[PDB]
Design a protein around this nucleic acid. Sequence first.
RNA 1: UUCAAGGGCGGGGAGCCAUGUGGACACGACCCGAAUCCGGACGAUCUACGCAUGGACAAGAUGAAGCGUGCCGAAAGGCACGUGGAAGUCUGUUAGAGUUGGUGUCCUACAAUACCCUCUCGUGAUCUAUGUGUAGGGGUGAAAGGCCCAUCGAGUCCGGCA
RNA 2: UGAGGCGCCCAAAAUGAUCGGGACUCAAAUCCACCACCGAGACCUGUCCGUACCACUCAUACUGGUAAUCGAGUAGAUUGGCGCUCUAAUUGGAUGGAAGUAGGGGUGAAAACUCCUAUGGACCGAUUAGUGACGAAAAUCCUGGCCAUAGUAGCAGCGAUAGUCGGGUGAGAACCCCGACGGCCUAAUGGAUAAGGGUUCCUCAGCACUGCUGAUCAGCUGAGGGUUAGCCGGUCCUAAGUCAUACCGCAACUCGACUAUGACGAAAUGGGAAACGGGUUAAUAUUCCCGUGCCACUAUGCAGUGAAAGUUGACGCCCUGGGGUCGAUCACGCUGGGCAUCGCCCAGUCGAACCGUCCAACUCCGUGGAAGCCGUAAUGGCAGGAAGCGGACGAACGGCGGCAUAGGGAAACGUGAUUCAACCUGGGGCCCAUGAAAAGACGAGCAUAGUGUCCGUACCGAGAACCGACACAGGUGUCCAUGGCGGCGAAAGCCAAGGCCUGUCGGGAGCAACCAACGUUAGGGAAUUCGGCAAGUUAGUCCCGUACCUUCGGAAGAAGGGAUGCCUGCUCCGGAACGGAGCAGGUCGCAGUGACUCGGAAGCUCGGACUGUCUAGUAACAACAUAGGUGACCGCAAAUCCGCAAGGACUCGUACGGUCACUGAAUCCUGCCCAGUGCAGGUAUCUGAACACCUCGUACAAGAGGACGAAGGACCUGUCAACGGCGGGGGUCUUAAGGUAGCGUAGUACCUUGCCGCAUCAGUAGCGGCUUGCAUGAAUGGAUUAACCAGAGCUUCACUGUCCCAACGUUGGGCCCGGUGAACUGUACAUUCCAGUGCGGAGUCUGGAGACACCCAGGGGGAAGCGAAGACCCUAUGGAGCUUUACUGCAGGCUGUCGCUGAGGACUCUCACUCCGGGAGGAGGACACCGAUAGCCGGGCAGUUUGACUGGGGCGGUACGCGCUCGAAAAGAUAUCGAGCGCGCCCUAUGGCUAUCUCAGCCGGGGACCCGGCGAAGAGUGCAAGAGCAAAAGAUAGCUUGACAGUGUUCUUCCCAACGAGGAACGCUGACGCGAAAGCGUGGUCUAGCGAACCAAUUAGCCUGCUUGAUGCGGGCAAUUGAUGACAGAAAAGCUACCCUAGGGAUAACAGAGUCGUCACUCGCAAGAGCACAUAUCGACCGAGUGGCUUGCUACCUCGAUGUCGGUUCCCUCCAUCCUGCCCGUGCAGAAGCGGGCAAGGGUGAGGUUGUUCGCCUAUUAAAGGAGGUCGUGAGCUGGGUUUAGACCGUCGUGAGACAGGUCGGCUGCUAUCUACUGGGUGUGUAGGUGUCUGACAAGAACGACCGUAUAGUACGAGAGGAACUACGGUUGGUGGCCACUGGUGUACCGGUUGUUCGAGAGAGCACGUGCCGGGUAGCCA
RNA 3: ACGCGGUCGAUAGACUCGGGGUGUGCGCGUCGAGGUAACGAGACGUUAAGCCCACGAGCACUAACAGACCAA
Length: 237
Amino acid sequence: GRRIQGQRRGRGTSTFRAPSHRYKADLEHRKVEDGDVIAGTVVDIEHDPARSAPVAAVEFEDGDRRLILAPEGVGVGDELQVGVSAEIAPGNTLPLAEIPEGVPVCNVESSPGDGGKFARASGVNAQLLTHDRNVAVVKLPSGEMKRLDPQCRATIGVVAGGGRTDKPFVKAGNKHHKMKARGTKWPNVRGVAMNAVDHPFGGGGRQHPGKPKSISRNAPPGRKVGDIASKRTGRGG
RNA sequence: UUCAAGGGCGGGGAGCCAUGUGGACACGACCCGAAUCCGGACGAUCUACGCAUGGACAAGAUGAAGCGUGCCGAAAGGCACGUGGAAGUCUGUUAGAGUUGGUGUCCUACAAUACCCUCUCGUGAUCUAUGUGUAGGGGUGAAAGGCCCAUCGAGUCCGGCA
RNA sequence: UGAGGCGCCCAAAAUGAUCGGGACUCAAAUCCACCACCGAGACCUGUCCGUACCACUCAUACUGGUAAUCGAGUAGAUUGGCGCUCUAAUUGGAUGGAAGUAGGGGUGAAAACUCCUAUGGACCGAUUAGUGACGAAAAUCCUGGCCAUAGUAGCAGCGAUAGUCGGGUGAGAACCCCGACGGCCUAAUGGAUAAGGGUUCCUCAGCACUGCUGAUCAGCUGAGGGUUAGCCGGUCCUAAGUCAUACCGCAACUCGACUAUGACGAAAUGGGAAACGGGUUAAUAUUCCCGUGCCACUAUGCAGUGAAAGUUGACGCCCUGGGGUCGAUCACGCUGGGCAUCGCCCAGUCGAACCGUCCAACUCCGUGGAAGCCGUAAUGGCAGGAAGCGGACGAACGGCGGCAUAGGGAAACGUGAUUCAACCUGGGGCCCAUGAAAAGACGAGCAUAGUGUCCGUACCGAGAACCGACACAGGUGUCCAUGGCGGCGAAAGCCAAGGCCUGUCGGGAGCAACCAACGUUAGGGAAUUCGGCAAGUUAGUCCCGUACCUUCGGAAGAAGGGAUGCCUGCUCCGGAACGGAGCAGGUCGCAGUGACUCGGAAGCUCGGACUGUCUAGUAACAACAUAGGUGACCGCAAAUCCGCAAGGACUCGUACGGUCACUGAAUCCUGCCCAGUGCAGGUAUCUGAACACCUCGUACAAGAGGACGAAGGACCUGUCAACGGCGGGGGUCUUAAGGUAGCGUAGUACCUUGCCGCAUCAGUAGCGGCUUGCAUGAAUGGAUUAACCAGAGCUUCACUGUCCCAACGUUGGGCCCGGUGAACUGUACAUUCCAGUGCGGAGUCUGGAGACACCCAGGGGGAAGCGAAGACCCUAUGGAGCUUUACUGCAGGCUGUCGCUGAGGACUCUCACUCCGGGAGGAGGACACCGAUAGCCGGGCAGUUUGACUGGGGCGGUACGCGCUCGAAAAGAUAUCGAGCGCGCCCUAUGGCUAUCUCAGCCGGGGACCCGGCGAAGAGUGCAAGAGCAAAAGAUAGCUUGACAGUGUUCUUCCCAACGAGGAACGCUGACGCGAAAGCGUGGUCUAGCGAACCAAUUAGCCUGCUUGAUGCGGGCAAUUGAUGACAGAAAAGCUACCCUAGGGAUAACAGAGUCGUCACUCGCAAGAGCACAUAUCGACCGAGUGGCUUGCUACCUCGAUGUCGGUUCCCUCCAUCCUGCCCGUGCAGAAGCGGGCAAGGGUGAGGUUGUUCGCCUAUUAAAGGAGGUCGUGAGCUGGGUUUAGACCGUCGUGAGACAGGUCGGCUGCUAUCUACUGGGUGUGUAGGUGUCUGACAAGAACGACCGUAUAGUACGAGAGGAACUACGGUUGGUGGCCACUGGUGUACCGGUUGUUCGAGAGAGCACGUGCCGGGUAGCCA
RNA sequence: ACGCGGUCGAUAGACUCGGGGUGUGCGCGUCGAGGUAACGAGACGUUAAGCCCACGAGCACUAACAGACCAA
Ligand SMILES: [Cl-]
Ligand SMILES: [Cl-]
Ligand SMILES: [Cl-]
Ligand SMILES: [Cl-]
Ligand SMILES: [K+]
Ligand SMILES: [Mg+2]
Ligand SMILES: [Mg+2]
Ligand SMILES: [Mg+2]
Ligand SMILES: [Mg+2]
Ligand SMILES: [Mg+2]
Ligand SMILES: [Mg+2]
Ligand SMILES: [Mg+2]
Ligand SMILES: [Mg+2]
Ligand SMILES: [Mg+2]
Ligand SMILES: [Mg+2]
Ligand SMILES: [Mg+2]
Ligand SMILES: [Mg+2]
Ligand SMILES: [Mg+2]
Ligand SMILES: [Mg+2]
Ligand SMILES: [Mg+2]
Ligand SMILES: [Mg+2]
Ligand SMILES: [Mg+2]
Ligand SMILES: [Mg+2]
Ligand SMILES: [Mg+2]
Ligand SMILES: [Mg+2]
Ligand SMILES: [Mg+2]
Ligand SMILES: [Mg+2]
Ligand SMILES: [Mg+2]
Ligand SMILES: [Mg+2]
Ligand SMILES: [Mg+2]
Ligand SMILES: [Mg+2]
Ligand SMILES: [Mg+2]
Ligand SMILES: [Mg+2]
Ligand SMILES: [Mg+2]
Ligand SMILES: [Mg+2]
Ligand SMILES: [Mg+2]
Ligand SMILES: [Mg+2]
Ligand SMILES: [Mg+2]
Ligand SMILES: [Mg+2]
Ligand SMILES: [Mg+2]
Ligand SMILES: [Mg+2]
Ligand SMILES: [Mg+2]
Ligand SMILES: [Mg+2]
Ligand SMILES: [Mg+2]
Ligand SMILES: [Mg+2]
Ligand SMILES: [Mg+2]
Ligand SMILES: [Mg+2]
Ligand SMILES: [Mg+2]
Ligand SMILES: [Mg+2]
Ligand SMILES: [Mg+2]
Ligand code: NA
Ligand code: NA
Ligand code: NA
Ligand code: NA
Ligand code: NA
Ligand code: NA
Ligand code: NA
Ligand code: NA
Ligand code: NA
Ligand code: NA
Ligand code: NA
Ligand code: NA
Ligand code: NA
Ligand code: NA
Ligand code: NA
Ligand code: NA
Ligand code: NA
Ligand code: NA
Ligand code: NA
Ligand code: NA
Ligand code: NA
Ligand code: NA
Ligand SMILES: [Sr+2]
Ligand SMILES: [Sr+2]
Ligand SMILES: [Sr+2]
Ligand SMILES: [Sr+2]
Ligand SMILES: [Sr+2]
Ligand SMILES: [Sr+2]
Ligand SMILES: [Sr+2]
Ligand SMILES: [Sr+2]
Ligand SMILES: [Sr+2]
Ligand SMILES: [Sr+2]
Ligand SMILES: [Sr+2]
Ligand SMILES: [Sr+2]
Ligand SMILES: [Sr+2]
Ligand SMILES: [Sr+2]
Ligand SMILES: [Sr+2]
Ligand SMILES: [Sr+2]
Ligand SMILES: [Sr+2]
Ligand SMILES: [Sr+2]
Ligand SMILES: [Sr+2]
Ligand SMILES: [Sr+2]
Ligand SMILES: [Sr+2]
Ligand SMILES: [Sr+2]
Ligand SMILES: [Sr+2]
Ligand SMILES: [Sr+2]
Ligand SMILES: [Sr+2]
Ligand SMILES: [Sr+2]
Ligand SMILES: [Sr+2]
Ligand SMILES: [Sr+2]
Ligand SMILES: [Sr+2]
Ligand SMILES: [Sr+2]
Ligand SMILES: [Sr+2]
Ligand SMILES: [Sr+2]
Ligand SMILES: [Sr+2]
Ligand SMILES: [Sr+2]
Ligand SMILES: [Sr+2]
Ligand SMILES: [Sr+2]
Ligand SMILES: [Sr+2]
Ligand SMILES: [Sr+2]
Ligand SMILES: [Sr+2]
Ligand SMILES: [Sr+2]
Ligand SMILES: [Sr+2]
Ligand SMILES: [Sr+2]
């Protein structure tokens, strides 16, 4: 047959690329030698096209102007701190080791100094649980207990823009506008609605996947469609 | 070959070469005749979809939130009028886009997809120009096997090839 | 009373009857005889030829001889010869005329040879031996040329109907130019331009070419000429993004991703230093020239120390205030023009960049001091300081002054105002959407001077300059969006500025038929049709008023009702408008949204929620999307995906994420099932590869085995919003469960037009209800649903030429004339018609009939018309796309192992390697990545296969390998999907021999046993059938292993007649068994019980392996066993309606033809009943026929196409007669029924469901008959149904996909050559003229039918009821004609009136060929 | 193609009547709701008006003239 849509994606042609030339910046934590002698002033609040959430423009002492992944509650004028000796307050960044257990954190690093990888989406937050000299335990938004180097930097507070998902798009047009700001091909034609030549589920008088949808993990691309290595399906049991 | 016997093959000197010709096999194999398959190339001046930079949408209708005034109420609020001007909102041959029916006209055409009337959309998932990207078992596809220069259930060109 | 001969009845078919025809009757018939003739290429006979043979001969050279016993021929075999090219040898011809060509003479059976004459003007032969790109009627053959077609189609159709009269030029003028008159275009038919074109631009001279006719013209031809820039583009910047170099990959590169660097990337339309006005040319022009101005750089001089912070460049969508120019308009003045019943109408009244100046809004400061005020269109503002007052900063492409005794104008050479595009500046709102960058500029003065190069510059920009082969009705971007009336308007309609008469052939006929567009139609009003298709109805605005239902938004402009002009004078809102809303009075018309513009309305049902998407070019939908619902994967060194790799998308992303799927708004809901399949988890035990390890083997190795055992499987569990499933039976069974809520005859229900009801005169429709659901049912989503819809179906009101039933008219064609001028098609012949025949569907054959030639117009019956090597069907050891648990493989994932890889069945470490980090260093770590290999999964991908037979194919079957009987026709052989029926073994005895013996069955004496008799065979003999067998081939007993080894002959397999395996009979040799012996035993009495090569194993001996010896392990001779049943041997599944090719009438579908079981109809016999009574009437059984309407059968015609059903329209026919006419019978009183006879003249109609045919139904009727004509009729119509491509449901299928089920949508080409006919002409014949006739022939339905009255309330009859002859009046259908009457038309005409233009008036144009409305003469019509 | 007339003529047109269609012309005068007036839709009279006719009659005024040819 012909390659399925999932395979066209991989080629990275314009149709499937994100509008990177329109994205602002990558809210990665600042790099400080040591001391925490770094503080900046929130100069403005902006809209981040790549995340549909607000971002805070900050001006640091040493003269560096950079956008930051803002938690909820940060406003113009406010002063933020970044470093080991940073004050324990919303909007400030410091290594987990300095954060007190039971404090909601966001933009958590996976490996000390990487800039932040976890809990960066609207209204989410990781929960710092256990402390130690060898391992900091964090409960990520998915509910998973993650073991991180106490040296991994993070920001206090939850990510700005919470509740974004509570309002329905209501119309295709609204979905449309949002999709135009992401690396995604939309709308979506169902596999069962295509010709046999175009998808494993295509073909047949009436629409239906003439086969079980739960596909094996070992399936090759082009065949791995439907419910990938499902441990179970449905709502029952 | 055979305890044995019986079979098979061969045996009392004619061949070798040349020229013409009959016929066989491989090769194009008396000549033309078709749908393929494969290789390397050339196409996104059409069109599909994306991106960049620009452009277009008379006029009218309806009258959401919000706000106001008055009245009622302890209050929460309610009621009336006004204001306001929302909307993949309505009418609309505005521009522009499209095409339900006539199974009209045409059907060696004006035209290898045209003409007329009727019809639909017309502030948005809108329409449109130019630039730009994606290439052949690959693209692109709100999916019709649609579209990728009058050609697509696998483009075109030349070659494989007689 | 029997028999025979001929005939009669029985006896009905479709265009025109037939024995071939005429026609024949003591025959021209039939039968019995006879007589004489005609009549082939046969037979006889003369001559000749060929061939075979004979004699003679070197001869196949002559000559002679023989043929009663020689003479036809497709495929094919054999042999002699003709012609063409060039070579060679020998030998000739030609300028006293070669070859070729044309016409003609002679020869040869013929291929072909040869001569003559004319032309021609230079080459040409013969013989012999060679050579070969050597012979054409054909291939939908190729190329070129050419005829008919034909002076034919086109040069008309488009909302752009365009001209006419004079004149100019010229050899020539409808279309080249001038004037007048008349028109066309207004987002274009005008102005400026982008792309693209490329000289098309201007001038002169031309008309052979090009131009839909002509041409003096031109985008054509010839020759010249034309594009001028510091300030308009380019050039500069960067955008998406591209390339180059480096680096890396790759076998490699012109290939490839990242990361660096550099460059490239915007001419209308991104950013951007600076130019305006006028004049000038045939053609350029912000470029030249005149006037004025401006920018950048540089130099000089003065000033300046500032200089980089900041600002700008620089930005989305929606609403809106303020400032404000042009334009437009109003008021008044000036200048000029127009008009002339008035006094109006038109134009102009100008003047730039630039320099200077003014500043509203926003922001801010001072003052002030609000506790309720300030302000807006709106939001809003304020003790964190409102209003007010003052101030800083600060706008226009704007105002004002200069510019300007510049320019421009014939002149005047204005002034105010309103509405205000441009442009300037603010306020508000929206985002799960956030609306470029860079160069540059400002910041940062002035004088003077110098420099400012390079490239583009014409023209078109489109119904003739671009693309579409064209001077193509198509396509093609930008700006002019503010010209006047109009009105809501960038709408219509009319008119300016400007453009044009080139959406380029004309002339003529009251101008016929017919067609395209269109106007008007009395009465009826959807009767038309599948369907109101088409057309129409409604319509603008204001007032009143508005239902069910609803998601409370909506439904809604629901519906329904009323008003609407003009004139006079006013009121209200507003600053005002040349803005809006009303009032009073007057008044005209048929009509006041007067034209134009401008909704028909309502209800029920199905589907999809909605806007949106789609098959460029037959599908716009119910299909796709969608928000919403749901499930799955993944913590980021992730999941998913691309790349061979280097690397990459997702991703400037991080679970409120984004990937993979399903369902498809809201609302109420979403049951049961984990057995199979899928996925996932677990797993004692079982199973599970390679490496390493161990044993055997080998001096080594191959190899055999063992131990260990990863993923995987077995096994267990979870999971259905995972594939899917929810039956049959009984009051459980398969296979897990056994269908819950709902809905239900459905777009799912075959039965089926289900049943009831509604509605209609009548309703296969539709709606409601019931519902056992052939075969509904819950995210394969169920139900339901307001709103929405060019979606499917139904009903109503209104309206109407859809119809009854057609008419008249309008414009363009059509017809005639000038000019221009194709194509399709053509084996030939061709004036046909009726029948027949024929490969059964003939203009050409046969028989008749008819037929004087040619031409014009027509509508299309036929040429199975033209156009396409049938799309349907089958066939091919064809193709392709698609599917899967088909065959075989390939990627990919998982997993073990080896290398990378290090130190001290579980562990630590660090040093390789990986990752994070700017770095230090941190994390990880011998793992991971990567290289190699092994096991599992693996339609993601590739190549293939998927057989044959067959009354076409599929399904079914196997007549696909064997045996018997019959078919089989008395030797042998012999077919069909022919009839009956078997074999794929079984048996160590059920084999072999010998001895002894005789069996079924029946009878007699004491179903077991014993005795006797009869008993040729009916028993038994393994199994089909047919056959064989009695001191046996059977039985019993005993013994035995010949069911043995080797090797043949012959027959069979395969008649004849070649072919393997297999089989049989018969031998020889060896060794045996039994018997006295002869002899018997090569399995079972005979005919079924079977298998190649390659490979393996096995048996016994021997041969052999690369210099040589030994050992291992191989190779071979002979044979046994292991299977291919598609059985003389491939390893092997499907779909295609997305399809494709080659062919087939070798093979199906429609139709034809044959048949006639079926069907229709008839006849014979007449049981039976009809109260009695065969025969008034009904009529079983059985028997005999006719037809060719039904169905079946066949495969004869046709696959290089003969278009389907139904309907429609139009014509002819048949009779087996429904009515009408005339009759007979009656269980006939009458009236009326019932049955029958002659008879085809005429008639046989309108409607409801349904595509329907048929049929069911309704009201009428004299009756509302049936059938044939290719189931007449698509070069006539329709397109509802059938029958492609899209889609849905049910059922089936794992799936692709299917269904002889349902359902929505879905394209109909052509200019007529011949023939045929309807009408119209010209000629010839009879044979200068006029007028009048005749009548062979030919056509008719010219007439058919009904009602009523008198007869008559009579005859008849108890009564009830109730005729006829005949004479009348009328209706209906058909027919021919006519217009006084009624009606229609009537773009003659007259009138009314809306918008606009001509100033008003008068009088007119346009609004489609009448703007609209009213009336209507002639004529034509019903 | 056919039919009629051609001066021995009414064949066609002009003109005039007749017969028809429409519906009361231009202009002027009076009136006219009003309005100081200007002005004024419309009404009445003149007006069986005006305009028009594919028909008929009369009428040689114009045109059927002039004239060419064939023919037993
Ligand atoms: Cl989303
Ligand atoms: Cl010869
Ligand atoms: Cl330019
Ligand atoms: Cl404002
Ligand atoms: K055929
Ligand atoms: Mg970031
Ligand atoms: Mg996008
Ligand atoms: Mg979808
Ligand atoms: Mg599809
Ligand atoms: Mg597939
Ligand atoms: Mg393009
Ligand atoms: Mg309002
Ligand atoms: Mg004779
Ligand atoms: Mg010689
Ligand atoms: Mg030749
Ligand atoms: Mg031939
Ligand atoms: Mg013709
Ligand atoms: Mg033209
Ligand atoms: Mg009518
Ligand atoms: Mg009907
Ligand atoms: Mg319609
Ligand atoms: Mg006022
Ligand atoms: Mg339905
Ligand atoms: Mg829809
Ligand atoms: Mg289409
Ligand atoms: Mg549509
Ligand atoms: Mg669905
Ligand atoms: Mg369920
Ligand atoms: Mg489904
Ligand atoms: Mg035909
Ligand atoms: Mg064919
Ligand atoms: Mg194939
Ligand atoms: Mg395949
Ligand atoms: Mg025999
Ligand atoms: Mg084999
Ligand atoms: Mg063996
Ligand atoms: Mg065989
Ligand atoms: Mg084909
Ligand atoms: Mg045949
Ligand atoms: Mg046949
Ligand atoms: Mg009869
Ligand atoms: Mg009677
Ligand atoms: Mg008749
Ligand atoms: Mg019939
Ligand atoms: Mg037919
Ligand atoms: Mg026909
Ligand atoms: Mg047709
Ligand atoms: Mg035709
Ligand atoms: Mg239908
Ligand atoms: Mg399909
Ligand atoms: Na192939
Ligand atoms: Na393109
Ligand atoms: Na249409
Ligand atoms: Na391809
Ligand atoms: Na041809
Ligand atoms: Na012309
Ligand atoms: Na819409
Ligand atoms: Na299961
Ligand atoms: Na079901
Ligand atoms: Na729609
Ligand atoms: Na009509
Ligand atoms: Na015809
Ligand atoms: Na295919
Ligand atoms: Na096969
Ligand atoms: Na069968
Ligand atoms: Na044999
Ligand atoms: Na018969
Ligand atoms: Na028909
Ligand atoms: Na009759
Ligand atoms: Na036919
Ligand atoms: Na047709
Ligand atoms: Na038909
Ligand atoms: Sr990052
Ligand atoms: Sr980083
Ligand atoms: Sr499917
Ligand atoms: Sr459940
Ligand atoms: Sr493009
Ligand atoms: Sr809309
Ligand atoms: Sr609209
Ligand atoms: Sr249609
Ligand atoms: Sr029409
Ligand atoms: Sr067409
Ligand atoms: Sr194409
Ligand atoms: Sr080739
Ligand atoms: Sr012969
Ligand atoms: Sr012969
Ligand atoms: Sr014309
Ligand atoms: Sr046309
Ligand atoms: Sr000439
Ligand atoms: Sr550049
Ligand atoms: Sr304004
Ligand atoms: Sr055009
Ligand atoms: Sr003009
Ligand atoms: Sr012309
Ligand atoms: Sr009329
Ligand atoms: Sr109807
Ligand atoms: Sr369409
Ligand atoms: Sr729902
Ligand atoms: Sr399971
Ligand atoms: Sr039930
Ligand atoms: Sr014709
Ligand atoms: Sr059949
Ligand atoms: Sr025997
Ligand atoms: Sr199957
Ligand atoms: Sr289909
Ligand atoms: Sr008869
Ligand atoms: Sr009768
Ligand atoms: Sr029926
Ligand atoms: Sr039929
Ligand atoms: Sr018929
Ligand atoms: Sr149809
Ligand atoms: Sr003659
Ligand atoms: Sr009586
Ligand atoms: Sr007109």
